[PDB]
Amino acid sequence: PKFFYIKSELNGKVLDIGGQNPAPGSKIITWDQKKGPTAVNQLWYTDQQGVIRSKLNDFAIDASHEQIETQPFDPNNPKRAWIVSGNTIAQLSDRDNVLGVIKSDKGASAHICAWKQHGGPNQKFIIESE
Ligand SMILES: OC[C@H]1O[C@@H](O[C@H]2[C@H](O)[C@@H](O)[C@H](O)O[C@@H]2CO)[C@H](O)[C@@H](O)[C@H]1O
């Protein structure tokens, strides 16, 4: 029941499941922080292991494709176990691999990818209580 927002230190927006799409494989973007029962697609929590999940469907963050998207949690899939570590959303099995915001080149909402930690604010996040 302890949910939170993940805000980018790059654009000050927050991780958000694209268009509130509940289906697995939905792209995760950054969007203006909403408030109320409509913020569900922007709310996250950590399971007992500390692995990040979405309040919307309990799905985990998955970095199997070009951009991060939601996918059912699988303890056997290394690209679906992401945890909070200070200012970074780190891959549980490889802390050197962290999430980072990447602005759009087409004037759309920014997307997210996972790559080597390079110290930029694009790879820093702030956990913000609900
Ligand atoms: O565009 C991302 C943005 O979508 C909001 O939801 C919209 C969707 O964008 C729009 O195309 C559709 O017609 O209506 C949806 C309901 O508002 C999300 O609420 C927002 O968080 C972003 O994900």
From TrEMBL:
Annotated positions binding N-acetyl-D-galactosamine: D16, G19, K34, N41, G100, K103, H118, N122
Molecular function, one GO term: carbohydrate binding
Domain Ricin B lectin: 1-128
Record key words, sorted: Lectin
Domain of life: Eukaryota
Protein name: 29-kDa galactose-binding lectin
Parent-protein start and end of this portion: 131 to 260 of 260
